[PDB]
Amino acid sequence: ALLSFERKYRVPGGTLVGGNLFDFWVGPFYVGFFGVATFFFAALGIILIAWSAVLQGTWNPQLISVYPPALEYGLGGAPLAKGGLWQIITICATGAFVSWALREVEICRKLGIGYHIPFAFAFAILAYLTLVLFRPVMMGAWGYAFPYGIWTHLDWVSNTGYTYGNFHYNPAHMIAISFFFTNALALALHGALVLSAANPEKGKEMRTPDHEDTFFRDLVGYSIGTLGIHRLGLLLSLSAVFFSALCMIITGTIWFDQWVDWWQWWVKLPWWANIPGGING
Amino acid sequence: DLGYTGLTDEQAQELHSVYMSGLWLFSAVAIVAHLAVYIWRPWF
Amino acid sequence: DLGYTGLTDEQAQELHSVYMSGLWLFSAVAIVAHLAVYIWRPWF
Amino acid sequence: DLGYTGLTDEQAQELHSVYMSGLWLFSAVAIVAHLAVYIWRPWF
Amino acid sequence: ADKTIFNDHLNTNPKTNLRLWVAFQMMKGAGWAGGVFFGTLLLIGFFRVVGRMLPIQENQAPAPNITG
Amino acid sequence: ADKTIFNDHLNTNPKTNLRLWVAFQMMKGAGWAGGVFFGTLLLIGFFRVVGRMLPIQENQAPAPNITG
Amino acid sequence: MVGVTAFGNFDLASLAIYSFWIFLAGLIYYLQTENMREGYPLENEDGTPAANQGPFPLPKPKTFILPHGRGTLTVPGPESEDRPIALARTAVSEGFPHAPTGDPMKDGVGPASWVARRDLPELDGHGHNKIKPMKAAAGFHVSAGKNPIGLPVRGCDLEIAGKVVDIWVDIPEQMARFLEVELKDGSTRLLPMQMVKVQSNRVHVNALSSDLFAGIPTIKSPTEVTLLEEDKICGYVAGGLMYAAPKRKSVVAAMLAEYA
Amino acid sequence: MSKFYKIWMIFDPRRVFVAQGVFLFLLAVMIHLILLSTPSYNWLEISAAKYNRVA
Amino acid sequence: MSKFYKIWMIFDPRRVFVAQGVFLFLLAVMIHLILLSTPSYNWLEISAAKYNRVA
Amino acid sequence: MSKFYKIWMIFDPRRVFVAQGVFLFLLAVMIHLILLSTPSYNWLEISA
Amino acid sequence: MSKFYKIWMIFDPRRVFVAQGVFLFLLAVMIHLILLSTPSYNWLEISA
Amino acid sequence: MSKFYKIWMIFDPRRVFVAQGVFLFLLAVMIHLILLSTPSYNWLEISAAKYNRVA
Amino acid sequence: AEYQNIFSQVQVRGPADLGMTEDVNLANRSGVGPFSTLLGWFGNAQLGPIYLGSLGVLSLFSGLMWFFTIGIWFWYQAGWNPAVFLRDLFFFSLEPPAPEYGLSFAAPLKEGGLWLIASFFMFVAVWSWWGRTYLRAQALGMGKHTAWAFLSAIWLWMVLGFIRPILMGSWSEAVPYGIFSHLDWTNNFSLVHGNLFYNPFHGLSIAFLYGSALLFAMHGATILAVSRFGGERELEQIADRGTAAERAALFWRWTMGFNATMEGIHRWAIWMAVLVTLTGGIGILLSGTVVDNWYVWGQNHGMAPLN
């Protein structure tokens, strides 16, 4: 149940809460206090999603949907069959995510590595809380959050996007999309480059980081370096999530019209607004 | 005699007596609050 | 004879007796609660 | 004597006997529950 | 770890000290949980205050999802 | 006054012991006040329950004093 | 072919989605088997092979031809620690921590662990040493940022433990890797650049207290550092984070220990 | 049946007991939820209709 | 049933007790929420209807 | 319940006390929130 | 406020702490009751 | 057929048993779900209609 | 706070690295460019040298011609007014031919022909760049993984611009050149085919794009966490497994029950990124040709409530 090198790393300590009360492993998983919390919240959320499937009347996993309370309920509680289950599952999900991050903190402390992984997960948790907690609270209703269904939260995304015309024109959305695309491109390039260095042409020696830098300089004239590429990947993903959270937190709170109407400000600058010709003239 | 925590039998007995005293006190306070709420607004 | 936790047969028997005492106390409280609920509102 | 888990034949026999005792107790409880449900509301 | 100069609290019988220590451990755990809960409540309140300042009620979006 | 056998609570630094003792004195006073208040509330609740059992609403007296 | 179904609702789109589910299952199997080339077969907490080995079997071994005539590496293959592990079982049952028998930072266990790698320097593409002191690196110099050379080095206990004498740079990457620090006794240790915070006046090392700086493993050659020495130094410094905690003078830690 | 005990020569009792506990709990929850989904055998709703709680 | 104590010769009581506490609290919370979801056995709504609290 | 004290020879006392304080507070908050959920017992719904 | 500590050389500490706990609880109860008195902030007036 | 035992000379028995257990459970669940999906052979619906429970 | 290794706290600069010479024709490689201190705070400060080969020259000429054709069309749409050009830079569009022309190359120059010219230039530029990636890998003896990942990206690009317009029998199906114009094309493509969200392959493409973001966050965070052990030198960890690779593997094993290797994580990375464009190309190819309304298709396949 242990890797060939895991034995020397399984030592007491690093726990945030509980000392040695939960300082143990179940199979490969390290439990800890926050692991106990994460498992409880996850099991409760999954069982409540199954129960909401029972209440809804469908067992098809793609049709299972846990809708938030309707806008009539505001930010208060709702009956479980009509929005309260969504609130409980949201609380369970937030608890599970935060417990997962803190369990990762405990594992980082035990292994003596930096806290970059829980810190990066905190960004995803913040984007989730923007979608389910911060934005609905700012707008004043839990019905502005998305349902917990495989294809119904896509309906939420579609309706929220088309509320503001074409959502492509949200500028923070544009920045987040560019970050996402660049992150996917950089991940493809990085995986491919490391694999090409480590799996060269058959019968040839394994390559070195010098070969990787030479390849990318001969390709695009610049090489960011191994440390550089890993920093870039982390920053691209985190910036994408940060700007998506920003785009959703400004939408419906400080912006209410179509976003192309936002883009009209550049067109109507005084020195070229009235010039005929072009597209907006 | 398992002693996973280094506590002897007597230490465990004394600590459990203290803990149970606190548990019964907390339970009594909770029962008082429940009586107050049930008189104010019964749920049965 | 089989050893996976380091407990002896006597220690295992004592632990299981205490655990069963706790289980039967929990089951007794659960049965009392179920009787109370069934009297208040039966489900059969 | 494959011994993937390291148990001897006697240990495996004793473990399996206790496991089957538990399985038969569980199965008997399940059979009683099914008889109760079938009497209360048959599904056939 | 440095000895206290007050020395008046030392007159309590040690069993009361044990009870105080148990209550302190439980109160420390409950206080950390309460700090987390009240920080979450204050975050929600901050966002609610910001939403009140913003003109959400003047022009608010329709329901993104079918009510349920 | 008899020494405790647990001895694990003794590992706390004495300044935390002083803080616990101060909190314990304040909590003892507040708990006695709370016991008095909750006993009064339970007496009022007992009389309210008795009044509910009795047919007060079926035939209740008029106002003994002019309203004010 | 809009609406052309072979059977039921199964059309070209359904064919594509089911074939992709099959392909994704196969790809996950392939990726997991590729990931199973290190750390396998699984072992018990005593060292013997475990009864459970996982649903995914081991992949067929593959050979890497190491550069610069460093031999070959076949994975999966027979791998051992090749070092005594100073840990003692804290429970007969599996899944529990192993307590260090002695000083974990000296024992190299826990967060202070290190791996018995090749006792040879890491080489660049040309075959020269990858990491070299900046004095022995031709033309290398500090280009930007605060120059750490000459600054005092402060431990986690807020006590000066030496001064920075030289910077060890990675010649291909052209980035600093190790700071060479002279202690009070005149000997020099290495500190990973990722574990030191170069401030305006001093270099702060939150991982190690001052008294632990002497315990850092030393390099057998003043001009080159091997992979084994790098691993030992990095393991020692990082394990200082969890094992020099009592000596660390953090205010939040002090307040937490006040109530704990 | 005579030689089934040798399964414990192949399968570790700890792993199998944990897996069996999880499997049995999940199976029992699944079957109870299946029954609760159907309008019949939903014993809560059956009792509500029998004693006319919904009024 | 007399040999069930041997379950502790296989499973360490610490992990088993943690798992059992989590499982029991999870099961109790699940059953309570299942009861609260249904219009019947939602004791809060039952009392609200009984004492004419909900308009 | 005579030999329940032996549970303190399995689990460390101070750790269990801290975890139990957390559990009690979280349970209290959960029950309060469930009460606030229902229209009756929603004591924070002071209305005209 | 530098020399306020000298008030503990006038009044006994433990007695003052007990009396102050009583005072704080009674003040809290008084403020809660005054809030319950007003029609607004009367959180125990859950109505249909 | 006589030499089929030699499959165990080729296949690791423990991995085969785990895969077979998962396969058999998933296959049985799949067949039961297929039966429950069809309006006929949904034995719960059949029993509801036979005893006129759905009313 | 401690050093998080996000930015270098000190920069060292030495001689310019001219790169390896495995089988690269050094004549075609340019000289080293300037050192950028700003870039050095994050990665390598060195710019260049770049390889300017035959395929590099072809790709650069074709891409320059594509860019210049789009720019000249934008200048025409601006009335040659620099102020109008800057005002409406994102609103200009080089639209494909109208549907009446089908796939024919008879569309007028200002009504689709210039789009065809620009598309030919872009086609040649992109394919020559793919050949350039392949040959740059081949000259250094490295594997062709970059070539195949770029081939996945090119597959999506070809489906969008070439294959799907051919299967639909109209160049009007192709993507216009322009910022907001191609955003509007994306939106109108979703609207015409009935809520592309219900395209299962679009859903898979989004799953793998989110997985790419998640996996690059995880991998960058892991390598930055273990860089204190020299974890950034990943090829070394592949050749000689240090404590960095072991600590990363153990972190992920204790967190989620399974881990990768220092090399296998990059297989995860390349496949997670490749499947984005692979499933995306398949989903776009199916739209219109096989499924004209994805919401109705999802209804018939149990993905949407009605039906």
Ligand code: BCL
């Ligand atoms: C209203 C809009 C519609 C919609 C309509 C579409 C359409 C239409 C498409 C997508 C596509 C995609 N969508 Mg969608 N999409 C919507 C909502 C979403 C949401 C969301 C949260 O709501 C998300 C996350 C996504 C996500 C995604 C991606 C997974 C996918 C694109 C992969 C990619 O990188 O393409 C970008 C990458 C490329 C196009 C590859 C480019 C490769 C070439 C070689 C590059 C050449 C560069 C050139 C030479 C310039 C060089 C410059 C010099 C170097 C300087 N969509 C809604 C429902 N979406 C695509 C897809 O595949 O769908 C199945 C697609 O075509």
Ligand SMILES: CC[C@H]1c2cc3[nH]c4c(c3C)C(=O)[C@H](C(=O)OC)c4c3nc(cc4[nH]c(cc(n2)[C@@H]1C)c(C(C)=O)c4C)[C@@H](C)[C@@H]3CCC(=O)OC/C=C(\C)CCC[C@H](C)CCC[C@H](C)CCCC(C)C
């Ligand atoms: C910030 C950059 C990206 C990021 C980073 C990131 N995510 C991370 C990490 C990091 C660095 C981890 O360390 C952690 C991890 O361990 O990954 C393997 C994690 C993680 N990223 C995850 C997924 C994930 N990340 C996503 C996104 C991203 N993660 C960002 C793009 C997405 C999407 C949609 O984009 C998903 C699905 C998990 C694999 C893992 C967190 C695991 C976890 O929290 O487990 C406990 C929770 C459960 C087991 C869920 C069930 C129990 C819940 C109580 C119920 C929740 C129900 C849910 C609300 C229903 C939603 C249904 C949908 C159809 C609507």
Ligand SMILES: COC(C)(C)C/C=C/C(C)=C/C=C/C(C)=C/C=C/C(C)=C/C=C/C=C(C)/C=C/C=C(\C)CC/C=C(\C)CCC=C(C)C
């Ligand atoms: C969805 O489900 C809902 C929420 C609707 C319903 C919930 C259901 C469930 C599953 C509820 C769960 C209930 C459980 C499991 C509750 C458990 C409670 C326990 C075991 C509480 C124990 C408390 C113990 C305490 C507080 C002990 C304290 C000890 C001390 C403080 C030390 C002793 C000190 C003393 C006695 C001070 C004495 C002082 C004076 C002045 C006398």
Ligand SMILES: COC(C)(C)C/C=C/C(C)=C/C=C/C(C)=C/C=C/C(C)=C/C=C/C=C(C)/C=C/C=C(\C)CC/C=C(\C)CCC=C(C)C
């Ligand atoms: C959706 O489906 C629904 C939910 C509707 C229906 C539900 C279905 C299911 C799946 C129900 C599940 C039922 C099960 C499996 C219930 C299990 C109950 C059990 C096994 C409970 C056990 C309780 C045991 C207890 C509370 C024991 C307590 C013990 C103690 C307090 C003492 C512990 C201390 C010890 C042993 C000291 C030992 C130490 C020494 C040194 C000897």
Ligand SMILES: COC(C)(C)C/C=C/C(C)=C/C=C/C(C)=C/C=C/C(C)=C/C=C/C=C(C)/C=C/C=C(\C)CC/C=C(\C)CCC=C(C)C
């Ligand atoms: C969707 O499909 C539906 C749900 C509609 C229909 C369902 C279909 C299917 C696929 C149903 C699946 C049924 C199956 C496969 C059920 C399997 C049940 C089994 C095998 C249950 C086993 C129970 C065993 C138990 C409870 C055993 C307990 C044992 C003990 C308590 C004693 C353990 C102690 C030991 C062994 C001591 C060790 C000995 C020594 C000497 C140390």
Ligand SMILES: COC(C)(C)C/C=C/C(C)=C/C=C/C(C)=C/C=C/C(C)=C/C=C\C=C(C)\C=C\C=C(/C)CC/C=C(\C)CCC=C(C)C
């Ligand atoms: C101001 O300075 C000057 C004017 C000098 C330079 C300025 C240039 C400017 C302003 C450039 C602007 C460029 C922009 C905005 C470009 C936007 C490009 C975008 C957003 C493209 C998006 C999608 C494009 C796709 C999917 C293209 C696909 C194309 C293909 C797959 C190739 C199709 C090939 C065909 C039709 C070949 C047909 C021809 C023959 C001979 C068979």
Ligand SMILES: [Fe+2]
């Ligand atoms: Fe990497």
